[PDB]
Amino acid sequence: LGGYMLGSAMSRPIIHFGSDYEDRYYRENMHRYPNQVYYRPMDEYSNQNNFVHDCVNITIKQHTVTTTTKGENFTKTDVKMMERVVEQMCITQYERESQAYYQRGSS
Numbered sequence: 001l002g003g004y005m006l007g008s009a010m011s012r013p014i015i016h017f018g019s020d021y022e023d024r025y026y027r028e029n030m031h032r033y034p035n036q037v038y039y040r041p042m043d044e045y046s047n048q049n050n051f052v053h054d055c056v057n058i059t060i061k062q063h064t065v066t067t068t069t070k071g072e073n074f075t076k077t078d079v080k081m082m083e084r085v086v087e088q089m090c091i092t093q094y095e096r097e098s099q100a101y102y103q104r105g106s107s
Contacts (some may be wrong), residue, residue: 001038004055007096009035011047013088015081024065027080032072034063039093042101051097052090059086 012030016023026033037059042051060082064074074082 001058003068004038004040004058007037007039007089007093010034010089010092013082013085013092015088017081017084022081025077029078029081033085034059034067035084035089037089037093038062039090039097042097046096046098046101048091050091052087053092055090055093056083056086059090 012033012035013027017026037055039055045080049052060079062084064079068074
């Protein structure tokens with residue numbers, strides 16, 4: 001956080017971990033799971049891999065600090081699903097910035 005941007009809630013991505021046990025666990029904890037991510041402007045060699053990668057670590061590292069002190073509790077299992085759910089959320093924002101970068105033209 002600091003030199004990044006924040007994207008408001010959109011839609012909690014659907015992830016598949018082990019089986020129905022974990023599936024229903026996360027699905028029932030979506031309300032306690034963050035739906036916002038932190039994305040940064042596109043740099044040299046515009047790629048979705050680097051965009052989402054850097055977005056995942058910051059998003060989880062950010063919520064675990066404030067959200068866990070705002071009225072939540074992210075444990076080992078919480079960060080696990082968060083990693084997968086945030087990764088998808090980062091891709092969504094990737095297209096959001098890619099639409100403005102592609103329309104920006106050659107500047």
